[PDB]
Amino acid sequence: CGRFFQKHQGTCFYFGELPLSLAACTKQWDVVTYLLENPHQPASLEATDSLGNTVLHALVMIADNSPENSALVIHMYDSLLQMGARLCPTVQLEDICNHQGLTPLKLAAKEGKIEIFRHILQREFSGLYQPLSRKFTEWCYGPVRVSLYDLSSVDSWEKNSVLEIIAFHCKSPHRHRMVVLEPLNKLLQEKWDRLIPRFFFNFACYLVYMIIFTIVAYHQPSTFGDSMLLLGHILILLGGIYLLLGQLWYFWRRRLFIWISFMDSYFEILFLVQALLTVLSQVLRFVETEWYLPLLVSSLVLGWLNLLYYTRGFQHTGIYSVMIQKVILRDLLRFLLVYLVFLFGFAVALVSLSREARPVPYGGILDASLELFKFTIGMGELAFQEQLRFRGVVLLLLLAYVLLTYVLLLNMLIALMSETVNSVATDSWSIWKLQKAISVLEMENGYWWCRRKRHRAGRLLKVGTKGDGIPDERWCFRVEEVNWAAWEKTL
């Protein structure tokens, strides 16, 4: 456990700080056998390091997304697992918990590994070493294949599953491709199909609440009507506090998720803000302060815009929302910065001028900035102000501002939006798949007041007998597929 051996930033190379792990990680398929079959002092394959990793953990840590590195990692992983089958058949090397509490499959997901993780998720072996496999084939009748994928530690029925690690714990920039591979993709779609009624019931309840919000905010004073108004008032106080409690529970449960993915939620912050503003407005109304209506109407705007959360759940409109977000993030803040610099330079210049008399426009900085923004809209006034003999300077400044802003910046913004939308069309689908995944994982749990029963997804299949005694049964996931390509090579 040296500094040069520990995994950190700088001069380091982590390999598990064990001779067997070092031999396995360096593609030496000559001495690994001798490290176990030496009669004088055999080594234990299930040995662990100070950090808590084993040889398989060491192998998955060194994995990258490079093709050669993947070839090495899967080759050595399979070979070492096969060797472990022949040395200690009783104890399995697959289930060895780290000090963090992660198996090799979960470590492949948290660390952001995509090539070794995919192979572990779908691996097959021949008749010998059959039990140490994930994907099985039930029957190959004709050209239709029935694949059984093992759902060990990947279904959300357990406490810390792979699906909860990809969607909440992985902090890789491009984890959305991890939730699109076959096994997981057939599972998430089925879970989503099972959860359509709950999603749309939540949407309907929120829509009714927002309609009540609009009704109470509209029909309010500058009796029976007063009774209904008070009823709606208290009802919306309760609704706001309910939303606040739900969002607070979400953030308490995901305290370490905001740092990991801060632009992947951006709807829980908005919901929390809306609920907080509603509660504050309702409680502040009692103080009879004049700043009730602005808070109420700001909360109303935010609530009516929050339906874009429930926008996703459909194929096209959710991808549209994802593209909206990506356009907002990438090519809208640079343009805003440059445009604001231009605006607040020219406004100051016009305010400095225009007091040279040979109401008056460009009185203050706010008025000049507003006029220039009117130029941006399409309602700006470009007139030859003959009142003051600095006519030419004002006209030339206005024309230069128009040329630099209306012609350059907005049209170039349209061009940049076109480029961004063209570029991110491919990734837009996978990001929306990940959004469904997060929504489904939230929906498997109940609310902050009710606990939904865990509907264990999967089927118990006769996969054959374990290596010692009577048959071993594991919960698999069935998928039928038609493939003429792999059927021609079995006959």
Residues 265-294 that bind ligand CLR (CB under 6 A): 266, 270
Sheet containing 135-137: give its strands across.
135-137, 144-150, 471-482, 459-465
Which of the residues 294 through 353 are near ligand CLR (CB under 6 A)?
Answer: 298, 301-302, 305, 308, 321, 324-325, 328
CA distance 262 to 319: 19
Least Å distance, CB 68 to a second copy, is 5
209: Cβ contacts below 8 Å, ≥ 6 apart: 236, 239
What does 256 bind: ligand CLR, a second copy, none (CB cut-off 5 to 8 Å by kind)?
A: none
Q: Is 404 in the site for ligand CLR (CB under 6 A)?
A: yes
Residues 316-375 close enough to bind a second copy by CB under 8 A: 316-317, 320-321, 323-324, 327-328, 330, 332, 334-335, 337-338, 341-342, 344-346, 348-349, 351-353, 355-356, 366-367, 370, 373-375
- If one asks whether residue 88 binds a second copy (CB under 8 A), the answer comes out as no
Distance CA 293, CA 297 (A): 6
- φ and ψ at residue 337, rounded to 5 degrees: -60, -50
Please identify which residue in the block is written with the tokens 């995901």.
254
CA distances in angstroms from 375 to 345, 370, 393, 483, listed in the order given: 15, 9, 18, 61
Q: Does 217 bind a second copy (CB under 8 A)?
A: yes
**Using CB under 8 A, which residues numbered 373 to 412 contact a second copy?**
373-375, 377-382, 384, 390, 393, 397, 399-400, 402, 406-408, 410-412
Nearest residue (CB) to ligand CLR, 365 versus 408:
408
Q: Which is nearer to ligand CLR, 230 or 305 (CB)?
A: 305
Shortest Cβ 273–ligand CLR spacing (Å): 9
Question: What is the closest distance, in whole angstroms, from the C-beta atom of residue 117 to ligand CLR in the complex?
Answer: 30
Closest residue (Cβ) to ligand CLR?
400
Nearest residue to 463 (alpha-carbon basis) of 75, 120, 124, 68: 124
Determine whether 413 is exposed, middle or buried from the number of CB atoms within 10 Å of its CB (0-12, 13-18, 19+): middle
Nearer to a second copy, 110 or 233 (CB): 233
Q: Is 251 exposed, middle or buried (0-12, 13-18, 19+ CB in 10 A)?
A: middle
What secondary structure does DSSP assign to 128-179, as a single string?
TT-SS-SEEES---TTEEEEEEE-TTTSTTSSS-HHHHHHHT---TTGGGTT
Is 207 a residue that touches a second copy (CB under 8 A)? no
Instruction: Kindly tell me which residue out of 160, 189, 214, 465 binds a second copy, with binding defined by CB under 8 A.
Output: 214
Which residues are near ligand CLR by CB under 6 A? Answer: 266, 270, 298, 301-302, 305, 308, 321, 324-325, 328, 396-397, 400, 404
